[PDB]
Amino acid sequence: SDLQARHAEAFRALHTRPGAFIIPNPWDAGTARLLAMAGFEALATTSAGYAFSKGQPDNIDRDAMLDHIADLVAAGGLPVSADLENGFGDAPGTVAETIRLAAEAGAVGGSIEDATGRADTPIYARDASVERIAAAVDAARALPFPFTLTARCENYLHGRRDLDDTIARLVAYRDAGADVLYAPGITDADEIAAVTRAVGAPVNVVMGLQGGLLSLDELAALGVKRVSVGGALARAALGAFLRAATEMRRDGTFTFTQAAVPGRDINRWFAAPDNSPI
Amino acid sequence: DLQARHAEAFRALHTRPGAFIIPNPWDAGTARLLAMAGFEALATTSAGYAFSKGQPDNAIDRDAMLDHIADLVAAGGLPVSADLENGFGDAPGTVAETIRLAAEAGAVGGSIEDATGRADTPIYARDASVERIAAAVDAARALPFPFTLTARCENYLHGRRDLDDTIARLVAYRDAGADVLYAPGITDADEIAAVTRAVGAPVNVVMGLQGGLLSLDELAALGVKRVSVGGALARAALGAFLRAATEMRRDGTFTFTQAAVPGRDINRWFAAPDNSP
Ligand SMILES: [Cl-]
Ligand SMILES: [Cl-]
Ligand SMILES: [Mg+2]
Ligand SMILES: [Mg+2]
């Protein structure tokens, strides 16, 4: 991969052109392929989608994720932003190593969140959080291509729905060198517009995780740059899977198969040596 | 002993009256969910597994399928019947080794089909086919628990919609010792009745592959013992995935998320230490 450097630049450029773009979240090679064929320009991994595929609830082994990143890089042929949880450890050096490893696995971007995993103290202290992002940035800037670092503030997922602390963290992460800022759980249009105005740098908003829905155009008008979907695609697939299971158990019928992608089509598409829209 | 109890449970499904559905998961999560939905056994799918891997059907190797069976045995906690394709080679001894390995991976049954993968000679000659099933039967009989061997005739998937030759193959496979007979692609009710009338031993019919649909009741009235879905559950899942992708590309909206399983539900279910209903 001089390919990696090409993807890195293409990915960074998605963030500076006008409008917002969607970064969808496959959880296996198949889905990665299909999203490229659909015309998406980047992919993001989903620790949640990945977990559901393994029959586990959300929250992951670093080595398992590194393998997963490499699988989706190979399959998709697109730039991949990796969900790297909290960097798989508390210490800044751990976060930094995680960034290097994720790049080595082929990612051209990734996210580091400020959730500790400890219910007592579910969000890292501001100082410690910023030091963490600073270490991630230094690792990112030592790479020989532009690595797009997303800094996550997890406040709204852990009962601290405080807009002002959340903005302050994101601003502090931006000032530490983060390229993209993301607060999952903020869904209100007015709250989102205040985030994007205060942050200025690119903001990612996730759709379908909680609350209400906005379109990509609505989000662009609120100043959002990137829109992701976390585990929602995996959960869409699973909702259809469950409806089929239920039909079979309750009725003994298979009409669910009528809306399935025909075998003939998917075998043709996956027989191709690339993911050309087609 | 757990594999022995499953093997007995799976054998018993086939001998009890009426028909049953054997659904086809393609990962650990789909295996757990089917077990939670109250199904009594699971079948792997060469097709569904390939598609998760970004591969067309019949592109997966034996070692990968073996790991996959073991993953699904562990995740589901139910008897597993493995799609073992053509046994991953032409030679009877390769077929026999595939059965032994499948059993080692935790399967209590599996299927060996008569497709060669050679476009211009797509189905094994009769004698060769029977020899292959004989070797599978010998390997199954060497196991310390009853292994339920399904013998597949692939005629209908390779442009030979010849009911008589297909029947005659499944009868030959039965006479060589196969426990279950399966010809994918037959969906006509009269054809299916002709198959179960000629074969007598348990028949598997697949639904959702091609052609028409019938209910489990309708299939059981035609003599069918087992109804599978091959890659159709994977393809269903993928259908929904694709409608979501298309919605996002066309409209830039995310309303597909309304029909998705809530995250709170899937996390609660998978946090469980087992697959209780
Ligand atoms: Cl999710
Ligand atoms: Cl299929
Ligand atoms: Mg996570
Ligand atoms: Mg197959």
Describe the structure.
The structure is a homodimer. Chain A is α/β, with parallel strands linked by helices. The first copy, chain A, has two domains: 1-230, Phosphoenolpyruvate-binding domains (TIM Barrel, Alpha-Beta Barrel); 231-278, Single alpha-helices involved in coiled-coils or other helix-helix interfaces, CATH 6.10.250.2750. Chain A contains eleven helices and eight strands. Chain A has an eight-stranded parallel β-sheet, sandwiched between helices. In chain A, helix 5 packs parallel to helix 6 (126-141). At the A-B interface, helix 2, helix 3, helix 10 and helix 11 of A face helix 2, helix 3, helix 10 and helix 11 of B. Bound molecules: chloride ion (CL) (2 copies) and magnesium ion (MG) (2 copies). Residues 46-47, 57, 83, 85 of chain B line the site of one magnesium ion (MG).
